[PDB]
Design an enzyme around this catalytic site. Structure first.
Site, PDB file in Angstrom:
ATOM      1  N   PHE B  84       0.853  -1.158   0.000  1.00 27.82           N
ATOM      2  CA  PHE B  84       0.000   0.000   0.000  1.00 27.82           C
ATOM      3  C   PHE B  84       0.897   1.218   0.000  1.00 27.82           C
ATOM      4  CE2 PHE B  84       1.135  -1.033   4.450  1.00 27.82           C
ATOM      5  CZ  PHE B  84       1.812   0.159   4.784  1.00 27.82           C
ATOM      6  N   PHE B  86       3.033   3.085   0.960  1.00 32.26           N
ATOM      7  CA  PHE B  86       4.451   3.465   1.200  1.00 32.26           C
ATOM      8  C   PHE B  86       5.130   2.618   2.262  1.00 32.26           C
ATOM      9  CE2 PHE B  86       4.211   5.589  -2.620  1.00 32.26           C
ATOM     10  CZ  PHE B  86       3.473   6.779  -2.585  1.00 32.26           C
TER      11      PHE B  86
END
Ligand code: HAS
Ligand code: HEM
Ligand code: CUA
Ligand SMILES: [Cu+]
EC number: 7.1.1.9
Lengths: 557, 166, 33
Positions: B84, B86
């Site tokens: 997702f 980062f």
């Protein structure tokens, strides 16, 4: 109306000049970024500087979006048009339907500008791939979709010139350059469907506000339909130039009409059905399909190798013509003091390591070793950034006289060289950096200078990358002074401007006849072209529409 | 010279065409070879495996990351992963050495990539979709995960960790 | 005139770079399998 009246006799010089300048500005703009991207992989953040200099760039990513879109979509599009129209035209001494042609150039420039706007604005940082769900400004997609439809114009225009040259010449074989460009623009047409399906069906609705989501597994399987062949559409205009002009700048004659038709024929058969090689690491795509496109992609490497021999043997035979004599005699005899020549022949040299890159890449399972790593740009700079591009550069030192009447002063000529050698030794240096770093797992599309302690073992490639950065910075700059001084030049002595393109004569055989005749079955093979697409992207596209799953877009920059 | 040269050349190009074909097939042989031993584990699951990125992180095996290793054979573990904007979940991914790990990976946002530095695990993570791949972690220790697909602005930051246990 | 040795050298080097790269990568593929 005219004091360079040109354009009521050969006005197609007008459209061509314009196109090509576009390309080159695209290239001069896009490339501005590259040296920065270079020091980035160098582990050196030049974006403080760049940022100041031109202050509208927000992120590395916008940079790499401009460099991507303007250099590889836009610059190679305007060269391909310029070349694969202006040549087939002239080999037939025929006028391209110039109503359409300026429609062509207008679409382009509108399209570009329509699109360029969100991009300088920072509202469509989604890369030259604009892989959904990362969600671009609507003016990006309509912008790009027009500017690409701009080549459907040119497909017709050329087929125009073919249609009518045959009305004037019943029972007469399509002359080489014109033949090349027909099988070219057909090829592009099959290939152009993919992105065009993706733009209409999905990208535009979704970005206009007219839907919430695109399924991103289709979004990118449509994208790669086109997005492979496009590299073949960048490359073939430089093959035209290489096959039928180069050997005459070289001192010589091309050694086979049939051979060059043969290779071109093959890029209409195998250029389009192969773009799962781009998806070897995709989910929901069946391993056997991936293995088939793996096979197909190996076949497609074949024309290009045959090109290796035809082209090397020509340059060899010339070499002996200008009194070459060792096993490498023939080489130093060639006219190393000509940019028309030095450019594509340096480009051709780093094609040898570049191809060996592609063939790895294309071997399915081996792709998992390098996919999305610096390795890739490594391969693809060798291919388009050097080969296609340098061919384009060298061809200033003939196309420009031909089209402007402006001549090349012996000190502009000594410049070309410096640039062409400065550029080439750059790529090569940068090649080694990328490939290398690539193999140390260094990803790609990444501001790695921002996490400077992160690739410990990339220390030594990173130097090559730095240095290449300085070199091609120098290289690119020399190229701007040079380009804007072969153009910011009132001295036009156009005795050399009416002057027709240095086409190269063929060494004909007896075989020539029965075989060139079979490859001139153009309509037939262009059906085998679409048969091969249907069977290949066929039970995969069946599926993924039987199971669409569109998903909200995100903007993440 | 001139048309004595044309024969030689046409015959040579034949020799060429021939050797390119052989060599290319050895390759198609060699490729295929890999495709039938274990190491084709990393090739994605070709079967479509639909999910819903909006509720992937709230319901399902990716909703609770204590619940992402899931023993599944005498020597098998399924790992549910989430890529997702980062980072990756779980962090870290603790699996046993020797085991057949079955990564199953999907995304709540945009495509990221899942490149387990030091292996041929190299899979593209697509929102809407579960990518499935097999791997057998042979030597223990620490494997970094790099996202190798531009997923927006924290991109160059997007890493995780696998700890194959001793 | 004769045998086109120049071009053959060119596909030799070619052909070997092709091998260098393909064999080399294969290797690594395994190394990491
Ligand atoms: C214009 C451009 C390009 C051409 C050239 C090109 C050719 C190939 N490529 Fe590629 N490529 C791939 C496989 C191939 C193969 C098999 C070929 C073939 O066409 C290569 C055949 C060429 C040769 C076998 C070279 C023959 C050498 C000649 C002809 C020179 C002879 C020299 C002479 C005659 C000089 C003699 C003179 C003297 C003076 C001595 C794959 C995998 O299947 C990927 C995806 C990998 C991944 O994981 O992302 C890929 C990715 C790319 C993408 C990256 C797209 C993206 O951003 O995701 C672009 C940049 C690119 C462009 C281009 N590529 N390629
Ligand atoms: C000064 C000359 C150039 C330099 C120094 C340069 C350097 C680079 C570097 C370092 C990257 C990738 C870093 C990353 O992956 O984020 C890159 C990407 C790329 N370059 Fe170049 N480049 C140059 C010119 C060109 C040319 C002439 C072309 C073809 C027109 C080209 C096409 C591309 C494309 C399509 C990408 C990938 C963008 C993407 O990932 O979507 N570049 N370049
Ligand atoms: Cu996730 Cu880049
Ligand atoms: Cu490709």
């Amino acid at each position: 109306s005219e004091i360079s009246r040109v354009y009521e006799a050969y006005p197609e010089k007008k459209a061509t000049l314009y196109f090509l300048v576009l390309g080159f500005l695209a290239l001069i703009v896009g490339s501005l970024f590259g040296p920065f991207q270079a020091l980035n992989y160098g582990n050196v953040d030049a974006y403080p500087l760049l940022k100041r200099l031109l202050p509208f760039v927000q992120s590395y990513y916008q940079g790499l979006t401009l460099h991507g879109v303007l250099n590889a979509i836009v610059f190679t599009q305007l060269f391909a048009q310029a070349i694969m129209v202006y040549l087939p035209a002239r080999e037939l001494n025929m006028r391209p339907n110039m109503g359409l042609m300026w429609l062509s150039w207008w679409m382009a420039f509108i399209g570009l500008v329509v699109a360029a706007l969100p991009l300088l604005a920072n509202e469509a940082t989604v890369l030259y791939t604009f892989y959904p769900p990362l969600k671009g400004h609507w003016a990006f997609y309509l912008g790009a979709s027009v500017f690409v439809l701009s080549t459907w114009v040119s497909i017709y225009i050329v087929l125009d010139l073919w249609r009518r040259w045959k009305a004037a010449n019943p029972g007469k074989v399509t002359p080489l350059v014109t033949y090349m460009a027909v099988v070219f623009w057909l090829m592009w047409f099959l290939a152009s469907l993919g992105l065009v399906l993706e733009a209409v069906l999905f990208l535009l609705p979704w970005s206009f506000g007219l839907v919430e989501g695109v399924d991103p597994l289709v979004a990118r399987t449509l994208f790669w339909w086109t997005g492979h062949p496009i590299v073949y559409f960048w490359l073939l205009p430089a093959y035209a130039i290489i096959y039928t002009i180069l050997p005459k700048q070289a001192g010589g004659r091309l050694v086979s009409d049939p051979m060059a038709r043969l290779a071109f024929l093959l890029f209409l058969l195998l250029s389009t059905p192969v773009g799962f090689h781009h998806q070897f690491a995709d989910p929901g795509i069946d391993p056997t399909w991936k293995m088939i496109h793996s096979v197909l992609t190996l076949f497609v490497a074949v024309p290009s190798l045959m090109t290796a021999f035809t082209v090397a043997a020509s340059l060899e035979f010339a070499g002996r013509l200008r009194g070459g004599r060792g096993l490498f005699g023939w080489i130093r005899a060639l006219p190393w003091d000509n940019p028309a020549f030095v450019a594509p022949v340096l480009g051709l040299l780093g094609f040898i390591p570049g191809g060996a890159g592609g063939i790895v890449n294309a071997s399915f399972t081996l792709d998992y070793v390098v996919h999305n790593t610096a390795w890739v740009p490594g391969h693809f700079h060798l291919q388009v950034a050097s080969l296609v591009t340098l061919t384009a550069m060298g061809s200033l030192y003939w196309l420009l006289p031909n089209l402007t009447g402006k001549p090349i002063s012996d000190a502009q000529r000594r410049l070309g060289l410096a640039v062409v050698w400065l550029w080439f030794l750059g790529m090569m240096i940068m090649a080694v950096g990328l490939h290398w770093a690539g193999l140390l797992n260094v990803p790609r599309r990444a501001y790695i200078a921002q996490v400077p302690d992160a690739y410990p073992h990339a220390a030594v490639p990173m130097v090559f990358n730095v240095l290449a950065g300085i070199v091609l910075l120098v290289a690119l700059l020399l190229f701007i002074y040079g380009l804007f001084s072969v153009l910011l030049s009132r001295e036009r002595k156009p005795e050399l401007a009416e002057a027709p393109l240095p086409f190269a004569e063929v060494i004909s055989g007896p075989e020539d006849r029965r075989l060139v005749l079979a490859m001139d079955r153009i309509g037939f093979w262009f059906a085998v072209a679409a048969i091969l697409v249907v069977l290949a992207y066929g039970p995969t596209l069946v599926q993924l529409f039987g199971h669409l799953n569109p998903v909200p877009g995100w903007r993440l920059w | 010279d001139q048309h004595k040269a044309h024969k030689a050349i046409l015959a040579y190009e034949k020799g060429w065409l021939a050797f390119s074909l052989a060599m290319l097939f050895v390759f198609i042989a060699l490729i295929a070879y890999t495709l039938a031993t274990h190491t084709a584990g990393v090739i994605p699951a070709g079967k479509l495996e639909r999910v819903d990125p909006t509720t992937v992180r709230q319901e399902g095996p990716w909703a609770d990351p204590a619940q992402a290793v899931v023993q599944t054979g005498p020597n098998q573990y399924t790992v549910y992963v989430l890529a997702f904007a980062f980072g990756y979940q779980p962090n870290p991914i603790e699996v046993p050495q020797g085991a057949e790990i079955v990564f199953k990976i999907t995304s709540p946002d945009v495509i990221h990539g899942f490149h387990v530095e030091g292996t041929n695990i190299n899979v593209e993570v697509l929102p809407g979709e579960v990518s499935t791949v097999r791997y057998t972690f042979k030597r223990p220790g620490e494997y970094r995960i790099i996202c190798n697909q531009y997923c927006g602005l924290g991109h160059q930051n997007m890493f995780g960790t696998i700890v194959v246990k001793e | 005139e004769e045998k086109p040795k120049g071009a053959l050298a060119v596909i030799l080097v070619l052909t070997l770079t092709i091998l260098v790269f393909w064999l080399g990568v294969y290797a690594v593929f395994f190394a990491r399998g």
